[PDB]
From Swiss-Prot:
Predominant location: nucleus
A Pfam family this chain is assigned to: WD40
GN (gene name): NUP43
Highest classification ranks of the organism: Eukaryota, Metazoa, Chordata, Craniata, Vertebrata
Protein name, as recorded: Nucleoporin Nup43
Naturally occurring in which organism (per UniProt): Homo sapiens
Role of this protein: Component of the Nup107-160 subcomplex of the nuclear pore complex (NPC). The Nup107-160 subcomplex is required for the assembly of a functional NPC. The Nup107-160 subcomplex is also required for normal kinetochore microtubule attachment, mitotic progression and chromosome segregation.
Amino acid sequence: IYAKFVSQKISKTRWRPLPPGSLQTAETFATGSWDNEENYISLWSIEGDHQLLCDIRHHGDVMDLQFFDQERIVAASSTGCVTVFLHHPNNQTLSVNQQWTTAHYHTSSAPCTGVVCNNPEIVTVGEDGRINLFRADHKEAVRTIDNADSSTLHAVTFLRTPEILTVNSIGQLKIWDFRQQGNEPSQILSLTGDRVPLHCVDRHPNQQHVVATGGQDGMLSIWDVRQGTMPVSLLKAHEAEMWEVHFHPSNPEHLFTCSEDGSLWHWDASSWLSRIEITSLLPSRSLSVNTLDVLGPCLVCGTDAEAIYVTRHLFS
């Protein structure tokens, strides 16, 4: 593993997906920054090293970031705007491809807090309680659900599309479907109480009913949406907020979490619904680790020390 300092607090880091049926490992990743007057979305290509491929100014903090496909990156802004940026296949520059400037708003600006992609669909959530389904090259949302909750939506994942699951500031998981009538969830699960925000969620890659969430209190919870209103497992973990949680996409016996307390943990259960081994990957006294991504043996993460950490050799 190695660090590179980049003069911006990094909110989001994501690997560019590999061409289908590629045998090479990930080598390009995107970053989004926050807490600057001038925030950026940047692309980087790879003692290891990486260099700046191109960048673009982003208005507002980068609240979330996902690749939609190899060339399109979707960003959520603190302004409420959702933007598709295009990385050109031939000239490698970034440009604004399309956007929904009123994805989230108060009727005042409402941050877009989460986005997930399943090409051609894009799903977004925000502090206005709106849940949007967008499709590439459609000017208007395909569907918007106006959630009437007094809580704040913090993150979203697909279950089986067009079914989704959201988590909120009072510790509830809510399930929705964009084909549904009305604005109510189909099911709710939650923590014991209303005092513990959930900040992140990820679905298991092969078991569409299994999700992991991370909380204000640093704990990892595992849920089975077929089973009751409560978690299956509640595991002590970090000393402060868990900001992201990811199942490894090709071997989900591995799972990764990161925290405000400066930690990034590699959990190795090699089932989550039933002795898990944990390794802490970053140095002691790191500032908040805001984000991570993993693909094959490659891990990238970004911190409030204005650092990006990379390894392309997690298992060798």
